[PDB]
Amino acid sequence: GAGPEMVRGQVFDVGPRYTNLSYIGEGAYGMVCSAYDNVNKVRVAIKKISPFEHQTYCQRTLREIKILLRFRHENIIGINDIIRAPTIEQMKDVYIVQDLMETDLYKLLKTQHLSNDHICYFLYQILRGLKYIHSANVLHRDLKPSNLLLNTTCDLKICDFGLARVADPDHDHTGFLTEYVATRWYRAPEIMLNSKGYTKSIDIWSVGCILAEMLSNRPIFPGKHYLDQLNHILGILGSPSQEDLNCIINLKARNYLLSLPHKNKVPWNRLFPNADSKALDLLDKMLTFNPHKRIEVEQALAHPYLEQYYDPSDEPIAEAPFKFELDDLPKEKLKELIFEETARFQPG
Numbered sequence: 232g233a234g235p236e237m238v239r240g241q242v243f244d245v246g247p248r249y250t251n252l253s254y255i256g257e258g259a260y261g262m263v264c265s266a267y268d269n270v271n272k273v274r275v276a277i278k279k280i281s282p283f284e285h286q287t288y289c290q291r292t293l294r295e296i297k298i299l300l301r302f303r304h305e306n307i308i309g310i311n312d313i314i315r316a317p318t319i320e321q322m323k324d325v326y327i328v329q330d331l332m333e334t335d336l337y338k339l340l341k342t343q344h345l346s347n348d349h350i351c352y353f354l355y356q357i358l359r360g361l362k363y364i365h366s367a368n369v370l371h372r373d374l375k376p377s378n379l380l381l382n383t384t385c386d387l388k389i390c391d392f393g394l395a396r397v398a399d400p401d402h403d404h405t406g407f408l409t410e411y412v413a414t415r416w417y418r419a420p421e422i423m424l425n426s427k428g429y430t431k432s433i434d435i436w437s438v439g440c441i442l443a444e445m446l447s448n449r450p451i452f453p454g455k456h457y458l459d460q461l462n463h464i465l466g467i468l469g470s471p472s473q474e475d476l477n478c479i480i481n482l483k484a485r486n487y488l489l490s491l492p493h494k495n496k497v498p499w500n501r502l503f504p505n506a507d508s509k510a511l512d513l514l515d516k517m518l519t520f521n522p523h524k525r526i527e528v529e530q531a532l533a534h535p536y537l538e539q540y541y542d543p544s545d546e547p548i549a550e551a552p553f554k555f556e557l558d559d560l561p562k563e564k565l566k567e568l569i570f571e572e573t574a575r576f577q578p579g
């Protein structure tokens with residue numbers, strides 16, 4: 232009859248439904264292809280995931296699957312299908328099938344000037360998807376240009392929920408210079424000072440960085456390492472006010488900030504001389520040092536910059552809060568949960 236398709240030293244075990252594969256890219260524990268879906272006659276995106284030797288990979292794969300199967304939103308990537316072996320024993324990989332998107336905002340920003348109208352529309356869609364995510368009590372926790380997918384008509388969809396958590400503001404506090412996983416350039420200042428990233432304001436900061444990057448095609452805070460990231464942030468925002476310092480009770484974090492020379496705020500209109508002044512007013516509100524004072528997603532949608540699109544009746548929320556969380560479980564039980572969670576896509 233036939234054999235399974237190969238790409239770049241990887242079996243792609245997706246047939247017969249999905250054929251005519253082309254390479255896209257590859258992460259640490261997976262690969263990505265486009266493929267022609269024979270049932271719904273359209274090309275799709277397929278990602279091969281091979282997580283079963285590491286619990287962190289298992290944890291992330293499971294998070295993504297559970298979240299994306301529960302969510303249904305125009306600005307959030309869906310899962311169309313999941314392909315895997317019929318038994319746990321035979322299952323070494325999982326294939327996640329999604330709507331094929333032409334590009335991502337990372338690729339687009341390296342090659343394309345965005346008009347103010349494109350920036351406005353991209354930002355609207357990001358916040359619209361984020362409203363839904365936050366309404367489910369979920370934090371994405373790794374919002375960045377490469378996790379914002381775009382199609383040929385500039386519809387935008389948020390992807391990659393492998394680092395997402397249920398929100399937990401009462402346990403957000405930690406010590407100074409506590410290690411963190413999410414992508415450095417989009418990390419809020421409090422991550423390096425006193426926060427575990429368990430509050431919704433962490434995602435708003437990332438969206439602010441994305442907005443700034445859409446305005447200039449360059450990351451606004453390109454730190455080269457953990458504490459350099461804070462150098463870059465303070466370089467533009469200036470020294471925190473007494474009031475903002477008084478919210479950091481942790482002495483190591485407090486005293487670090489106190490040790491720094493006075494830095495003046497760089498006006499947004501000097502960094503972004505061609506930007507819409509309403510865009511800069513909203514940027515300012517998203518990139519506020521004090522997370523308690525940072526604008527929330529629903530306020531950001533209601534901001535004058537987005538007035539041509541704002542329509543809360545057409546900005547849906549999740550039918551219920553998300554729940555259940557997995558941090559202890561070993562890779563063996565996590566394989567059973569991934570097997571269990573993907574079962575609806577099987578024949579039979």
Ligand SMILES: O=C(NCCC#Cc1cc(Nc2nccc(-c3ccn([C@H](CO)c4ccc(Cl)c(F)c4)c(=O)c3)n2)ccn1)O[C@H]1CC/C=C\CCC1
Nearest residue numbers: 257258260261276329330331332333334335377378390391
């Ligand atoms: O149009 C073209 N080529 C375009 C090339 C291109 C692209 C492209 C697609 C994309 N699509 C797409 N769609 C759906 C989902 C995803 C997607 C992407 C990434 N992740 C995440 C990371 O974010 C992730 C997580 C874990 C692993 Cl382990 C991992 F690996 C990746 C997801 O979770 C989901 N990504 C994205 C980027 N880039 O060729 C024509 C025209 C040319 C002329 C003539 C010949 C004809 C051919």
